Each structure stands twice: as structure tokens, then as C-alpha cells.
């Protein structure tokens, strides 16, 4: 029905267009609020340090637990579902999106792919629900783009929020009936709606075998 | 240098490219990203990009005429045309490595119920075309998927990686940093021990344990 989403990131501008994309009707009805927070607000030092070298050595940096702990202490409540995008996560799927669409409060913690110190999520899990999730089998430098994907996939399932109303979907067609020598499949113009459904099912089957044989 | 052209009815949604890693790649001159409003190629007063489907169905389908004109202008025979769609082949780390070597990516962002299939089919007669899914979920449009692809590709381009290119199927385990104790929670003592062999072994184990818990498919087990 209605959802608050807080996003925490060192790149708050990354989230601005998705804020601007919420229809005013949904905001005014109180169906949705998306707030973005600069993680640096919770830094302790004059240099606004958010990361530090990894224990046990090796490359990259790990985000500081003291900074994230303070940020989440402020932003989260007992009702919060804390979402942490990471290539090391459980898979985020359409089933996940449906589940999260009825939450009252998502907090999305965007960090670099080398990680937020694991104690942040471990501590947070003692007082709220935490879900570390991957949006696909690739690495991104940080969680921000994954956050945009999650926000969109979840909110388009909340009635009235984004303005929108197994086997893969097959090809779609519109006017004109002939274009650059390619005709729309004549079955779609036949007025035989049972036949059209069967044709679409076969297109779906062939496409799934070709692109996603894992689904069969 | 790589050129990335992104074509969309929401050019504003692509502004995040100027942030973080893509922004740094652009500033370093390793990539040029241009965003084009599809409506530039319309000719009617209402700048129509969509029409109702043939054969029935809810929603609308993006018109082939408008897309064909856009792609004619932007693409060459050397272009790799990328079409994000939940009905695509999977976009994976391997795809990202492959595309990191391309001279020209054009990313065609769809909305509504998708793009008339003849756009991709026509394009494939003159250039390489790849319809790809970034994951098993549905979005309202290709724009967020375009940003994911750009991020995943650009962090692998040689000007970004440097010496790392010349120097996988498992999840990274947990990471830690200072202080060694926080809220009563200690960093695993092995990581403080300075013993490189023991640390490597612990990290490998943690990686395999997290993989079996979170992603058993990666190790060839049932999901």
C-alpha cells in the first residue's frame, strides 16, 4: 500500500532522478517517500573517512563499521528491512520484489563491492531484518546502480506508485504491418484469438529454449 | 577509447552516469557517453513513440519507424547494439568482459511493453545485436539496466584496471576493518594473526561457505 525508502550512499546525486520520477499523485497520497542520505553525515573525522584498509590484507578498502553503525542507528527502526546490495548476496528476483512490495520501510545501504565491514550487517540483524542481495552475476563498483534497480522493481508492484499498470515473453509488434521488408506475423491480424494465444505460447517456448534453457 | 550511446525517452534518468566510476572514466577520457532523447526522431506534433500491439495485449509497443531512424543515425556496421529486456540472454560477468573491449556500444532503452521485434531483427542485418537481461525481475524500462551494464563494463576497461588486467565462479566472503572490536563483536582472530597462509585458507573457506548458503547453483547444487 504505502512505503518509505531511505537510501544511504556516498553518491547521493546518483539517486536524484529516481526521486524526481515519483508521480506527485503518489507522494501527495502518502503512498511513497524516497529519501537519500549522504553517508558522510555520519563520519567522525575532519577527513570524512568512510573506508579503511582490510584486515588480513589484500586490495581495495572496506567501509568503516563505526560510520555505518551510526547511520543505521539513526535511520532504521524495528520495522525496517535493511537491504544491502552486494555481488556476494542472495539473488534478488521477481519473487523478492513482490515480497518487499508490501514492506513499510526499506533502508538500502549502498557500499563499495569490497564490502561494508561484516559486523554492520551482523549487528543490525540482531534488531531488524537484513537481506544482502545480488541483482545479477556481475560485479559493479558499488551498490548505487543496484539500488536503482531494486527500487524500481519493488515500487512498480505497489499499486499507484510508479504510474504503470516459467517462460520468457515473445516478440511484440505494432504498426505498420510491413516495415523494411518485414511483415507482422499474419496470425496476429487473424481475429482468431485462441490461435493467437497458441502462436504466442510457441514463440515463448522457442525463445526460452534459445535464451534461457535453464528455465525449462 | 569507447563510445557509448544510450537512446531513451527519459534522458534525465541517465544522469547517474556522471557519478562514481562512470564519471571518473568519462573525466579520464577513457569513454564518451552520449544520451539521446528518442523523441528527436519523431515527426508528429505529439512526438509519438508508441502504439497499441497487434494481436492484443495490455499496454503499448514502441514504434519501429522511430527507432529505425534513430539507430540509422547513431549506429554503424561496427556497433554492438545492446537491448535490455527481461526476455534477453543473461548479461553476466563474462558478457561484461567481452563488451569491455568494444569500440562502440549503443544501448536502446525500451518502455511500455517493449520495442517492436523488427527493430532488433532489422538491425541484426547490418550490425551485431544482443538482447540481454540483467536479472530475473521486471522493470518499467531499460534505463536502470543501461546504467548497470555501463557500470559493469566500464570498471573492466584497460584504462580503469591498469596493471590488474595482466595480474570468479565464487562469492567473496566477509570483510573487516578497524577497530578490531566493535559493539562486542570481534574481527576473526586469524585476520589479525599476520599468517598469510592461514588467512588465505580462511578466506577461501569463507568464500565456499557463503557460496553454498547464498548461491548453491554456483557450485552445481539445487537452488
Do A83 and A171 reside in the same domain of the chain?
A: no
**Closest listed residue to residue A156, CA positions, set B139, B58, B134:** B139
What is the grid cell recorded at A135?
541483482
Query: Technique behind this structure?
Result: X-ray
With contacts defined as CB-CB under 8 Å, which chain A residues touch B88? 211
- Asked if residue A85 lies in contact with residue A143, where contact means CB atoms within 8 angstroms, the answer is yes
Query: Domain range holding B43?
Result: 1-166
Do A117 and A211 reside in the same domain of the chain?
A: no
Do A114 and A9 reside in the same domain of the chain?
A: yes
What is the grid cell recorded at A81?
528491512
CATH number where B180 lies? 1.10.1270.20
Instruction: Please name the residues in contact with A109: beta carbons below 8 A apart, sequence gap of 6 or more.
Output: A8, A68, A71, A72, A82, A83, A84, A85, A116, A120, A143
Do B103 and B199 reside in the same domain of the chain?
A: no
B145 to chain A: nearest residue by CA? A149
Binding-site members of B are 84, 110, 133-139
From B92, B117, B182, residue closest to A138, measured CB to CB: B92
With contacts defined as CB-CB under 8 Å, which chain B residues touch A192? none
Do B72 and B114 reside in the same domain of the chain?
A: yes
In angstroms, the separation between the Cα of residue B49 and the nearest Cα of chain A is 11
Do B137 and B46 reside in the same domain of the chain?
A: yes
Length of chain A (residues): 216
Resolution attained, angstroms: 1.7
In angstroms, the separation between the Cα of residue B43 and the nearest Cα of chain A is 16
Instruction: Please name the residues in contact with B1: beta carbons below 8 A apart, sequence gap of 6 or more.
Output: B29, B30, B31, B32
Report how far residue A166's alpha carbon sits from residue A150's, in angstroms, rounded to the nearest whole number: 21
Do A179 and A91 reside in the same domain of the chain?
A: no
CATH number where A40 lies? 3.40.1280.10
Do A15 and A108 reside in the same domain of the chain?
A: yes
From A148, A171, A200, residue closest to B147, measured CB to CB: A148
- Asked if residue A17 lies in contact with residue B16, where contact means CB atoms within 8 angstroms, the answer is yes
**Closest listed residue to residue B6, CA positions, set B144, B148, B146, B156:** B146
Residue A136 CA, chain-centre distance (Å), reads 11
Instruction: Please name the residues in contact with A77: beta carbons below 8 A apart, sequence gap of 6 or more.
Output: A105, A128
Give the number of domains in chain B: 2
Amino acid at each position: 500500500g504505502s512505503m518509505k525508502i531511505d537510501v544511504v550512499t556516498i553518491f547521493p546525486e546518483y539517486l536524484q532522478p529516481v526521486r524526481q520520477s515519483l508521480p506527485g499523485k503518489a507522494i501527495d497520497a502518502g503512498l511513497v517517500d524516497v529519501a537519500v542520505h549522504d553517508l558522510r553525515r555520519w563520519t567522525h573525522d575532519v577527513h570524512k573517512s568512510v573506508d579503511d584498509s582490510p584486515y588480513g590484507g589484500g586490495p581495495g578498502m572496506v567501509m568503516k563499521p563505526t560510520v555505518w553503525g551510526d547511520a543505521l542507528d539513526e535511520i532504521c527502526t524495528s520495522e525496517t528491512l535493511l537491504v544491502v546490495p552486494t555481488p556476494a548476496g542472495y539473488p534478488f528476483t521477481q519473487e523478492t520484489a513482490w515480497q518487499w512490495s508490501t514492506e513499510d520501510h526499506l533502508v538500502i545501504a549502498c557500499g563499495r563491492y569490497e564490502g561494508i565491514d561484516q559486523r554492520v550487517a551482523d549487528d543490525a540483524a540482531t534488531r531488524m531484518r537484513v537481506r544482502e542481495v545480488s541483482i545479477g552475476d556481475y560485479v559493479l563498483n558499488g551498490g548505487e546502480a543496484a539500488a536503482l534497480v531494486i527500487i524500481e522493481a519493488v515500487l512498480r508492484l505497489v499499486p499507484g506508485v510508479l504510474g504503470n499498470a516459467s517462460l520468457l515473453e515473445g516478440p511484440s509488434y505494432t504498426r505498420p504491418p510491413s516495415w523494411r521488408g518485414m511483415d507482422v506475423p499474419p496470425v496476429l491480424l487473424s481475429g482468431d484469438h485462441a490461435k493467437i494465444a497458441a502462436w504466442r505460447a510457441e514463440q515463448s517456448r522457442q525463445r526460452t529454449i534459445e535464451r534461457r534453457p535453464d528455465l525449462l
